[PDB]
Design a protein around this ligand. Structure first.
Ligand SMILES: O=c1ccn([C@H]2C[C@H](O)[C@@H](COP(=O)(O)O)O2)c(=O)[nH]1
Ligand SMILES: O=c1ccn([C@H]2C[C@H](O)[C@@H](COP(=O)(O)O)O2)c(=O)[nH]1
Lengths: 316, 316
């Protein structure tokens, strides 16, 4: 079935992965170098063995595609995936006068009463970003995130490259090119960023009127992150193919370090006892062609019928 | 045997690859997305089923490691791999007064008498680069090649990052880091370079005192290029491990487009009828530790006993 490479990867980390501590205190089981593939003509690889919210994946991708780096657009589609990076900034600034919020990541899991003074400041941070333009401009804007890396890469001569829009143009006019590459990795920013990009680079490929895409992901959270990651680049391959008048090939997912947090063992083992269902179908607006101007309603998911969601703690 | 993944890859492109024309007129059989691995504790992956000149691979790597971008150092170790890119420049310049050399690449294979007016200008270009300092500075210097990308990446504020030397420092002090990445892909240079880097990015990984390395190669000439590529990054993994006091793990070779030129079919089919021998051993100077100051004599290859070389035409 379509998601099997994903369950094979989980099985593999389970009986083959090495114990390694990491950047936190939450241990991992870990492998290095892995490759899986999804034939997108066979259906859309949103996991059926656990419910994944597509509406989140689809509004985060549109954000990236519009070159946007401001949380505000996410909040308008009730997408909180990026709140913590914005909040971090607000909180560690002059204008902030409130409970001290230091190491709020850990301390939301070790104190149920703190976790409500945190969820309080956050709801107020989001509300302000939504209603106060100057505030949004100051704290809503992440700066270096996929929307500027893909669409507005800063040059040493002070201009701005649309990496992705140029490559789309190369696909239309030189389909056989071996240089259809978008990189998110800037050696000059990377030492001072809070999160150097996990999705480091990707490459497109055309053959027999079919578009394929390969992602090099340096670091992957197998239980929580990877199910989102897969759907996000599978959708990108679909949007680009649609823009270029091509059919869709394969999505190839290459990993550097793929890890399983040790507080996710039971959840993954439960998931492995489920039996994949038939994959959903993806449907794109036949009438609209500029993907840079796609909106929520231009992407529908059909026949998605998943097992229930599995709750897991985030790693500190 | 140690090189089997390489012969499996050739076999795969042969009966599974798609005919695709390319950037020249010389057709290819082509696949997209492939991964192979070499356990470097099992020996050094220099192909035994065809003679590969290690002395070339080893002087080209030292060049890169010294941050050098000047052909001159190559010529001193009689290494001509990079001559054509330098010559191209010389020839397409004001100071050049000689036979017109336009499309000299093609026209060295379609004219046996031209091919000797080309080999004449080239021997004179190399001799000058070797003896005339101002000339070397002007035409010997490639500018953007792996030695500056790895060791002297230009920032937008006019300084210069030693990407590789910083990452070596990260390996010594944060071995478990998921961000041990060296990129050669600069979105601002790539549209104006004659050859955007084939070796796009690589990532190191440590576990149980062992160093592994994964290469993302966007485009690979399977018959001619890949045997050099493999040995070159396998040696890098060895030099870095030696510098950091680690043992050596695996070299993981990931491909975007891996192609076989159609004028290489007979040669590859002949190679596939050979039987791999035991792999050579690599030996590094036990007393010298700064790889940035390694020289030819600091790297020895032991027990390399290959089948004869197989002659093939370069693709135009
Ligand atoms: O879309 C995402 C975003 C994040 N991660 C995870 C992987 C790691 O657990 C963490 C990054 O930490 P470092 O790898 O930088 O150390 O983020 C994913 O798998 N997918
Ligand atoms: O070390 C090398 C250097 C070059 N190539 C080849 C692969 C391609 O045939 C060619 C690059 O052309 P483009 O891929 O940029 O189109 O160089 C290799 O395989 N290994």
């Amino acid at each position: 079935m379509l998601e099997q490479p994903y369950l094979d990867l989980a099985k593999k980390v389970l009986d083959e992965g090495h114990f390694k501590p990491d950047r936190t205190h939450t241990g991992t089981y870990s492998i290095f170098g892995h490759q899986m593939r999804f034939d997108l003509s066979k259906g859309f690889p949103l996991l059926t063995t656990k419910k994944v919210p597509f509406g989140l994946i689809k509004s985060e991708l549109l954000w990236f595609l519009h070159g946007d780096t401001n949380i505000r657009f996410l909040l308008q589609h009730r997408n909180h995936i990026w709140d913590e990076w914005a909040f971090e900034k607000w909180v560690k600034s002059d204008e902030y006068h409130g409970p001290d919020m230091t190491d709020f990541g850990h301390r939301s899991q070790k104190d149920p009463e703190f976790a409500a003074v945190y969820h309080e400041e956050m709801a107020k941070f989001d509300d302000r970003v939504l209603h106060d333009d100057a505030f949004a401009a100051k704290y809503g804007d992440l700066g270096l995130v996929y929307g500027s890396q893909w669409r507005a890469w800063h040059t040493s001569k002070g201009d701005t490259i649309d990496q992705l829009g140029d490559v789309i143009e190369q696909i239309k006019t030189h389909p056989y090119s071996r240089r259809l590459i978008v990189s998110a990795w800037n050696p000059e920013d990377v030492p001072t960023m809070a999160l150097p990009p996990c999705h480091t680079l990707y490459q497109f490929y055309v053959n027999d009127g079919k578009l394929s895409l390969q992602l090099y992901q340096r670091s992957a959270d197998i239980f929580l992150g990877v199910p989102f990651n897969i759907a996000s680049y599978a959708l990108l391959t679909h949007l680009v193919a649609h823009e270029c008048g091509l059919e869709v090939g394969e999505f190839i997912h290459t990993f550097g370090d793929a890890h399983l947090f040790v507080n996710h063992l039971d959840q993954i083992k439960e998931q492995l006892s489920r039996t994949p269902r038939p994959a959903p179908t993806l449907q794109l607006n036949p009438d609209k062609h500029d993907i840079f101007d796609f909106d929520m309603k231009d992407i529908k998911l059909l026949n998605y019928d998943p097992y229930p969601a599995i709750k897991a703690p985030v790693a500190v």
